[PDB]
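Dear all,

This email documents one entry for the complex benchmark we are building for the journal club exercise. For each entry we list the sequence lines for every component of the assembly. Then comes the predicted three-dimensional structure of the complex as a token string, followed by one or two observations. Please use this as the template for your own entries, and keep the labels exactly as they appear.
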Amino acid sequence: TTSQKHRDFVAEPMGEKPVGSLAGIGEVLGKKLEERGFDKAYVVLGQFLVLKKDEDLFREWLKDTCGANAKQSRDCFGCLREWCDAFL
DNA sequence: TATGAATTTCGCGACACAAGGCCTGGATGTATATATCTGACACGTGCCTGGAGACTAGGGAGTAATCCCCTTGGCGGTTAAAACGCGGGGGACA
């Protein structure tokens, strides 16, 4: 259902977690995202909120911004959406 | 395109690490022991007045006869008090 990384990210507010803290976002993808400018997880979330929490927008943008497959982009969107439901 | 490859991300074991629960001992105040002195504790003496002994009085006190009386003892009934059940709501309790 959910990755343990996803559950850990969901359980608490993100605060200042790096983009690598996102579920399905490891060293390589998180590093690529930081190179693209979204150096922080909350920057990526602001992008996600600007996309009006859209799954397709966020996942396709993530895929074209770091190279994540459907799995990693889907996990990242799910993590962001569930965190938004929990705290936002 | 179906297959492999790549890639990656989540799940897994060894390692070292630190924090908490008994074991132990020593510093800690308390009870034990002991030398010093000093005026009270006790001892002992002279005495005289209270204690001890004899004689008397008589009135207090023990004891028997009597009354009555009142205190013990029993019955009926009529209760009004006492006994028992209940609901509570307010007081004692934490």
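Observations: Chain A has five helices and no strands. The two ends of chain A are 22 Å apart (CA to CA).
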